Design a protein around this ligand. Structure first.
Ligand SMILES: O=C(CO)COP(=O)(O)OC1[C@H](O)[C@H](O)[C@@H](OP(=O)(O)O)[C@H](OP(=O)(O)O)[C@H]1O
Length: 237
């Protein structure tokens, strides 16, 4: 019965050891769609966790604008995404902030590149106590996408979508969601680490017109996973 008291603290809290946090994203109720993330208690009740809405998507723990704990930035193309916390943008930072207290953190970055298409998820590395090693870029070469491209693999973690395999009976590339043949698309995917395709860090799939299921494990927290999933709504595909 994973505890959820402080919504902001929960949002930023990495998934525990051998525990999978299972959630459900529900879409809505010009003006942009509002996605709601709820914890799927295994006893039957839902616990609100986060609300995300395009305006860049602002992710907040307050459903009832511009107050947020997370922010999702996309490129013009919809192929490069970066998730920030609610800290100070280094470009607008004052001398006092820059070298005395601190700037905005980068919680995640996503890149949607014959075979099945690739999806790259870059997150902050974890320390020896298994807690995110805060990445607060003071410039362009310190971001998650820049480190990823420059191969500064030290404090980061390179994840990717699990490769779906062609199924002869379905005549479609498929993924296996808990044993069930699932049609691979930008709406149904799993995030793993190349070196270990058996460990599902994140599993996202649609279960209705406006309903999807999202499960996540270590090192991810609800804010990263939720933001990764929103990037799939906003992507080129
Ligand atoms: O520094 C402040 C933190 O206290 C706010 O950051 P700052 O980036 O300087 O000021 C903002 C810029 O116009 C930025 O381009 C926006 O999105 P982008 O970050 O995706 O490029 C950001 O949107 P918002 O983060 O509120 O959704 C704005 O607030």
């Amino acid at each position: 019965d994973i505890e959820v008291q402080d919504l902001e603290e929960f949002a930023l809290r990495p998934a525990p050891q051998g525990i999978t946090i299972k959630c459900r994203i529900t879409r809505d109720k010009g003006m942009f769609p509002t996605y709601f993330l709820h914890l799927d208690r295994e006893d039957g009740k839902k616990v609100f966790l986060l609300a995300g809405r395009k305006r860049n998507y602002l992710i907040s723990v307050d459903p009832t604008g511009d107050s947020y704990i997370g922010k999702l930035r996309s490129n013009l193309m919809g192929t490069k995404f970066t998730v920030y916390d609610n800290g100070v943008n280094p470009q607008k930072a004052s001398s006092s902030t820059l070298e005395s207290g601190t700037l905005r953190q980068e919680l995640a970055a996503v890149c949607y590149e014959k075979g099945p298409r690739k999806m790259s998820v870059i997150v902050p590395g974890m320390n020896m106590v298994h807690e995110r090693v805060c990445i607060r870029p003071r410039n362009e070469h310190e971001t998650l996408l820049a480190r990823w491209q420059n191969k500064n693999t030290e404090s980061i973690i390179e994840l990717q979508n699990k490769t779906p395999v062609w199924n002869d009976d379905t005549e479609s590339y498929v993924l296996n969601f808990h044993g069930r043949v699932t049609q691979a698309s930008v709406k149904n995917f799993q995030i793993i680490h190349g070196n270990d395709p058996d460990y599902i860090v994140m599993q996202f799939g649609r279960v209705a017109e406006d309903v999807f299921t999202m499960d996540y494990n270590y090192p991810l927290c609800a804010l990263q996973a939720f933001a990764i999933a929103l990037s799939s709504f906003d992507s080129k595909l």
